[PDB]
Structure formats: structure tokens, C-alpha cells
Amino acid sequence: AKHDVFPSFHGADVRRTFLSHILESFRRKGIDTFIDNNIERSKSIGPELKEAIKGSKIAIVLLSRKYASSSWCLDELAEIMICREVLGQIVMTIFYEVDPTDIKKQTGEFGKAFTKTCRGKPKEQVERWRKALEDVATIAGYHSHKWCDEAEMIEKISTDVSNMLD
Template identity: 45%
Template sequence: MDARKAHKASSSSSPSSSSKRGEYHIFLSFRGEDTRYGFTSHLHKALESRGYDVFMDEDDLQVGKVIKPELLQAIEKSKMSVIVFSTRYADSSWCLDELVKIMECRRTLNQIVLPIFYNVDPSDVRKQTGTLASDFQKHTIRHKDEVVKEWRKALTEAANLCAGVLEDR
């Protein structure tokens, strides 16, 4: 066995053993109403079929509820986060709280972050314009200024990363 194969064998873990420890290869962040039964579910299935242990929150999230500690822990314990930005991603304070945590883990834990812009312009995410502008008008009324600033910063930071842009045709 050559050195590369030996290293891979000793450092890899099966999806089941990594999830038992609470660690995931990939955390998927997405707006359920937009992409759960389309793009994101196909992406989830494709990643798992290739042996990746993927965390995908299956619960319907309720407006006004505090982000679950288990969800924050899943973000922290993931090696990578994939953010599926869609037209209504920024409408969800839950998604924005996830995003803030993801970007924090990128800075503090060197987590890999891959944004995917699904039917949304990366520039709109970066600058919170287009459909995101009306979302932030609502957030400005409902939430504290420092929270909204944190969300804006996380969106800009994520949109500045190298990313994939996809559109339905």
C-alpha cells in the first residue's frame, strides 16, 4: 500500500462513524421553502451517494423560534458548509442566523464554505439589493440594528467567496 492510500485509510471515517461522533463532512444551509424538494434534496442525495456525511435539517422551522443548539453544534462540527442562496434565503432570520454561525466557523475553525447562488444574483446577496432589499426592510423593522448589521456582514462576506451560480432554465 502506498503512502497516499495508507494516509487515506487511516484518516477517513465512514459516514456512520462520523455522525455517531456528531461530526459531518458537510452542513447544508438553505431556505426550505425555496429548494428543499428540488435542488437541495438532489444535492444532498448526490453527496451522500458519494459517501459524504451531510447534515440537512429536515424540520420545518417556525418564524420567531430560536435557532436550535443542535443545529449550531452541527455547523461547528462540520468540515465544510454549503450555502444554497435562493430568492427567499434572506427572508428567513433562521437562515441568516445559520449564516452568521457558518461565517464565524470559517474565521475561527477554518471551515470551508462554498456558496451556491440558485436563481439569485451574487451581487444582490453581496449588496442586499433586488429581492433581498425588501427582506432587509422587514428585518430592519423587526430586529435590532446590531443583528441586522451582523446578517448584512455575513451575506457580504459569503457572497465574496468563490462560488457556483445556477439558474433553472
């Protein structure tokens, strides 16, 4: 391995706000977290990114309302789920202002974003994304709606993340 945590997230939803606080809390607890610049990304994930997902003991899927609007995020998710079966890789889920049923069934606004993304995409690739989304929602995780204090929720994420890597 080469990182503790690979974060998978859609930047527009969370990068300025919620993710920034998670990263601050992770470095405070010394959790080695992969970071990647927003501008650089190519049309496909490509090889460097996949090696980072392979190299991470934990993958944290931060699921947000427009996460399905990014083909890049959906490609990250498929690689993470393949890593879960083949490698030991642990997958954690943060349901940020989204219900798992919409993730599981591709329904609601998350489904609408997914439907627009799949327009123009190979049938096998669409099925891989759809299956990964269906699998990912069964992973029990943290729900932003059900925590009164977001700072307190993040501190619990860090505590659980640190416990799994020590």
C-alpha cells in the same frame, strides 16, 4: 468534526426540488450531510444547531431568492461565517437563481426580503446579518443560471465537495 457538510438553505425555495437532488448525489458519493426537519425549529437556532455547524468541515450556503426572508437562515449564516474565521471550516456558495451583487449589497428582491426580516430586530443583530451577507457574496461559487444542465452542475458540486474532504 462530526459531519462533512452542513447545508444552509431556505426550504421553500429548494427543499422539494434542487436540494433533494444535491442530497441524492451526496449520499451516492458518500458525503456525510447534516439533515434537519422543517417543523421542529424554534424561534432562535439554539445550541444543538450551532454545534452541528461547528462540527462540519464544509458549510454549503445555498443562496436562493427568499433566503433573506428567513431569520433562521440568516442566523445560520452568521454562525457559519464566525466558524470560518475561528475554525478551519470551508464555506462553499451555490448562487441559485440569484446574482451575487444582490447578496453583496442587499439589493433587489433579495434585499426586499432582507428589509422585511430586519423590521423589529436589534441593530447589532441586523449588522451581523448584513456583514455576513456582504462577506458571503465575495466567496466564489457555482451559479445555477450559468449551467445548462442542472444535473451536471450538481455532479460537479459533489466532485468538488468530495475532493475537499478526502
